[PDB]
Ligand binder design. Structure first.
Ligand code: LBV
Ligand code: LBV
Lengths: 315, 313
């Protein structure tokens, strides 16, 4: 039965069980994963409102100094570019990316998107023809099976992940692994099917708009935003669109129990519906840098197109 | 059918027989790169472009005996695996060579039956592609998508004019969006006859998704031999971006005052929906890595055109 979200934990909401699963507000956890930092800022003035508690250590500045400046002063070269790329009223799915040379922290990748009157800024550390070669190989795959196999093998070669699967949703939202590339010694998930509740209906809705989520370390504690609520609204900060967003503790338990230290998946979206996932596992924690993740994002789109094409060749 | 090419004493092309010029088999290439053909098994260099000596820095005869194994040691096994016998002519493999004579070359290979076609071009060596991808996806409708696409391509390439050129059901063409330098004629809204891109050119553009005329006044460079030794027949060059352009079309480009031209096919439901069409007033060799960006954009636009057309119908 579909039911509306509970309030999050920090607003006195209940703790989540196998029973009320589908009502966790996974988009507003009030916290981020510790391998990057996040700031929120007023979309018109550029006043800095919220920051992750670890921000001082990524950005090399005291909180009170950060919060006491506008983005115009903090990001003089990027602030006008942000404002042109992310105009008021734009969708929350639109992202702008730049690379910064920050004194204390080396090269940072900056990813920005806009939710209403809020700008959300994510900072992460950042670092030949493999993509072009893959694009052509995908297109020349003769059928859906060969496409799925080429796609899994390519992603594994690009990333070094221990396991890369192509998980396909059935009409009842039960899923099935239809191809996989895996490290020697791992047991096969190929052909196994998993119940629909493994990915509850509110996650699948989110996965249709924001096409990549990840869990870099399934044992890492989440880092709170400070303050936790958006001071504009005294309400929760929407983090659906932020890759740094904390993963559900239900899903992190489900991962640790499998022996997985790192998770990542890309949505494959066909005709406006979530067709399936490029899901990846690593046994140890593992951070895939932003520019490599971009390659996977591009492959997500290519695969969406090629899945349509291969399936049309099939009636 | 097709007329024989000129160099096999076929008729010269006119506006009476546009549909029959065998543009895939011109027997020549554009001079900003070099092309070798080679045997699929032996790696034996069978044809070369008369300009190969320039790019490769090799005494002419040296090449036309040697083997790819010898000539490209690191690459030759990769090719063997990447382009297995029986693969499609559409499948391409690329690498960057740090080659003694020329700082860096791009190498592009595909296979047509028993022949490997190798293309060499100068090359080199950020977020504009990722930023463009998200911009295309958040365009609210087909019109805005067209506008974003043309603007994005112009910004990435510096081309004087970028158009989105949409085919009607009878293959009449219509410019539905345009991004252009100040002080050019506007082609926005204009419609053109089907014959401007004849049926044989459209079919070849459904399979091979990018072509260009880097300089509308440059002479083609012959293949030597012109005929493939294997077959004593013309080498198919349709999958080669170095292919000499139709003189008919070079005449069209010159009459419009274009000096450099490039287009990318937008393919939806197995059919040619339209083209990203680029003009420059002067000669312009777009480097391979930037062309790759446009090739990606072509696929992304193909996806988004279907998405957007579905939310009208
Ligand atoms: C009470 C709720 C439970 C639940 C919730 C849940 N699951 C996700 C996300 C995912 N679950 C996945 C399931 C699988 N991963 C596999 O490898 C296999 C099979 C071999 C299955 C069936 C997957 C792939 C995801 C996607 C995320 C990822 O790739 O890591 C969420 C949403 C988490 C988030 O985005 O924060 C939630 C709430 N899962 C259960 O099993 C029950 C107990
Ligand atoms: C006897 C036939 C003639 C003919 C042949 C022909 N045309 C092409 C290719 C193209 N024609 C194009 C037409 C236009 N480009 C524009 O910018 C506009 C409008 C402002 C039009 C109408 C285009 C875009 C192409 C594709 C190539 C490109 O991007 O430049 C070919 C094939 C060329 C080749 O691949 O070698 C041929 C044989 N053109 C005529 O006008 C008639 C008289």
């Amino acid at each position: 039965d579909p039911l509306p979200f509970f309030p999050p934990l920090y607003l006195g909401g209940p703790e989540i069980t196998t029973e009320n699963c589908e009502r966790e507000p996974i988009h507003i956890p009030g916290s981020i994963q510790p391998h990057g930092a996040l700031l929120t800022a007023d979309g018109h003035s550029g006043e800095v409102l919220q920051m992750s508690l670890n921000a001082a250590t990524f950005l090399g500045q005291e909180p009170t100094v950060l919060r006491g400046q506008t983005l115009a002063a903090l990001l003089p070269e990027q602030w006008p570019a942000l404002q042109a790329a992310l105009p008021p009223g734009c969708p929350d799915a639109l992202q702008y990316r730049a690379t910064l040379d920050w004194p204390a922290a080396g090269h940072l990748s900056l990813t920005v998107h806009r939710v209403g009157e809020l700008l959300i800024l994510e900072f992460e550390p950042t670092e030949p023809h493999a993509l072009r070669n893959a694009m052509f190989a995908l297109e020349s795959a003769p059928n859906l099976r060969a496409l799925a196999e080429v796609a899994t093998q390519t992603v594994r070669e690009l990333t070094g992940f221990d396991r890369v699967m192509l998980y396909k949703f059935a009409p009842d939202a039960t899923g099935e692994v239809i191809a996989e590339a895996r490290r020697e010694g791992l047991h096969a998930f190929l052909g196994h099917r998993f119940p629909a509740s493994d990915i509850p209906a509110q996650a699948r809705a989110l996965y249709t708009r924001h096409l990549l989520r990840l869990t870099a370390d399934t044992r890492a504690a989440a880092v709170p935003l400070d303050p936790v609520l958006n001071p504009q609204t005294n309400a929760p900060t929407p983090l659906g669109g932020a890759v740094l967003r904390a993963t559900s503790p239900m899903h992190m338990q489900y991962l640790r129990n499998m022996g997985v230290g790192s998770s990542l998946s890309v949505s494959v979206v066909v005709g406006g519906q979530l067709w399936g996932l490029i899901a990846c596992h690593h046994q140890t924690p593992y951070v895939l840098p932003p520019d490599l993740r971009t390659t996977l994002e591009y492959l997500g789109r290519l695969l969406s197109l090629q899945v349509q094409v291969k399936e049309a060749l099939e009636h």
